[PDB]
A = this chain, B = another copy of it.
């Protein structure tokens, strides 16, 4: 019925989605060949939200991949779960961007946009009632950010009354693996703020923070990182697929998460993360979820909300539990810390309950929180951008390809107005 069409942008989005499609195929019982192999009747009735129907009872995902370099497409297709996607869903370009925002937005963005638009319309017209879309992209390179902004800035005008989710990999100061990354980050956020329903800020520093402090992994490769990202991106939309005592669709989260159209940058969080040694010692109980989850270490953003105020709060729980303790613990942590909450919204917390547990666990929790602590990350990107641009850093790559110098100034003027807009609620 309600269907979500998946998008992947750049090498980061392709690897995140490849692990994500591995996670929920195991959640819904799907082998690498594609055969349904399930032990319960509950795993099959809600499959059309993400899969199609094929001859012989096969299921193919509703995903399309966008990339400007086939050096990642061959690794995606040769992966353990690369044989499931239809070959027409793969879209590849012959001339890449080269970590450049300008290449994917102005010059090489116009040629690849026709093919990706043709395939998304051909698969979205099969939906009886389309619910929304979903995007994954990174701001550290122009392949997934130059295209990922122009595809969004087209398909909104095509489909205005739909809900749009994207996962943005915000660049980091200690994961500063690109010289021109302020330029990629700032001029994409300017387009991101005015033309997106839902954004999620995930940071590689905070991803490194969990694996060094909590999971105690010696070599946390990018497969383990995408495992953590897919853990919260699968559990955010459980209610579309699994019924519960208190269901909450992503539209139902969204209408309570944003009090203003521009306050759509959130801080996701996942509770049940425990090392191998401490797994035996720790107990799984309802206050154990909210204790670990409200711990400031467990965020996947590189800014602590202790400096700011909790603007609006959401929590999506998983598993069979009595939920008197759920309402008891949220009221306890709201009233104990009366300085981190805004005064003009009482009862800041959204709550969702899903009966079906995650695979291998009794209980879990997923957190979505809007706060004014995001103005820290925006002003730290802005100070590095204005430190480079006043000596006109890397002008010949950007000016000579077909844009004026005033596009940077209006992007900074918009972003300065963002920081001043987020300041008044603190």
Beta-carbon contact of A54 and B280 below 8 Å: yes
Q: Which residues of B contact A53 (CB under 8 A)?
A: 283
Kindly specify which of A55-63, A310-318, A343-351 makes contact with the partner chain: A55-63
Interfacial chain B residues near A55, Cβ < 8 Å: 280, 282-284
Interface on A for B, CB 8 Å cutoff? 52-56, 58, 60, 86-88, 122, 125-126, 277-278, 280-284, 287, 291
Cβ of A278: which chain B residues have Cβ within 8 Å of it?
86-88
Chain B residues near A282: list those with CB within 8 A: 54-55
Q: How many copies of the shown chain assemble into the complex? A: 2
Which residue of B is nearest A275, CB measured? Answer: B87
Q: Which residues of B contact A287 (CB under 8 A)?
A: 126
Q: State whether A280 touches B58 (Cβ < 8 A).
A: yes
A157 to B328, CA, bound (A): 28
Closest to A86 in B: B281
* Contact across chains for B126 and A52 when beta carbons are under 8 A apart: no
Q: B291–A60 contact, CB under 8 A?
A: no
A243 to chain B minimum Cβ distance, whole angstroms, is 27
**Closest residue of chain B to A213, judged by CB?**
B88
Q: In the complex, what residues of B have CB within 8 A of residue A126's CB?
A: 287
Residues of chain B contacted by A281 (CB below 8 angstroms): 54, 58, 60, 86-87
- 4 closest A-B pairs by beta carbon, nearest first, are A86-B281, A54-B283, A55-B283, A53-B283
A277 to B87, CA, bound (A): 8
Q: Are B87 and A283 in contact (CB under 8 A)?
A: no
Could you tell me the distance in whole angstroms from the C-beta of A241 to the nearest C-beta in chain B?
21
How many Å lie between the Cα of A308 and that of B186 in the bound state? 44
Residue of B nearest to A126 (CB): B287
Given A88-B278, A126-B287, 12 more contacts at CB 8 Å?
A: A53-B283, A54-B280, A54-B282, A54-B283, A55-B283, A55-B284, A58-B281, A86-B278, A87-B277, A87-B278, A87-B281, A125-B291
Determine the distance from Cα of A86 to Cα of B60 in the docked complex, in whole angstroms: 45
Q: Which residue of B lies closest to A88 (CB)?
A: B278
Bound together, the chains give a CA A122 to CA B292 distance in angstroms of: 10
Could you list 14 examples of A-B contacts with CB < 8 Å? A54-B281, A54-B282, A54-B283, A55-B282, A55-B283, A55-B284, A56-B280, A58-B280, A58-B281, A86-B281, A87-B277, A88-B278, A125-B291, A126-B287
Chain B residues in 8 Å Cβ range of A122: 291
Please measure, in the bound complex, the distance between the C-alpha atom of A426 and the C-alpha atom of B307, giving whole angstroms: 57
A52–B283 touching, CB < 8 Å: yes
Residue of B nearest to A53 (CB): B283
Closest to A52 in B: B283
Residues of B within 8 A of A58 (CB): 280-281
Q: Within the complex, what minimum Cβ distance (angstroms) separates A298 from chain B? A: 13
A60–B280 Cα gap in the complex (Å)?
A: 11
Chain B residues whose CB sits within 8 angstroms of the CB of A54 once the complex forms:
280-283
A53 and B281 CA atoms in complex are apart in Å by 9
Name the B residues within 8 Å of A56 (CB-CB): 280
Chain B residue at minimum C-beta to C-beta distance from A54: B283
Complex Cα distance, B58 from A48, in Å, reads 43
Q: Which residues of B contact A280 (CB under 8 A)?
A: 54-56, 58
